[PDB]
Target: Adrenodoxin 1
Amino acid sequence: DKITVHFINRDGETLTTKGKIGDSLLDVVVQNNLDIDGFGACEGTLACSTCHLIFEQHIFEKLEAITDEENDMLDLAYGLTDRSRLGCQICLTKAMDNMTVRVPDA
Ligand code: FES
Model:
């Protein structure tokens, strides 16, 4: 029960990494050590916005609940639209199965 993911970069933008349904925090990327130019700016615990990165709106948009409370760190994550969503505290999912993550560039 594993799930694949795609990581966007700058050179060829189109990384990737195999994950497991139920992964832990600050996982996946690091799990493989993907480029992830930044690798958990804060180191997690919420503080940065370069963790989850852009998330297929078909995954994020599928959430009718988000406010100053939910955001916490987001708020106006330079680049955030309707797909990205800071996590660094969420386990993998079937939705992310073959998802393309893109850093907002910070
Ligand atoms: S690494 Fe900084 S909030 Fe996730």
User: Anything to note?
Assistant: Residues 29-32 form the longest helix (4 residues).
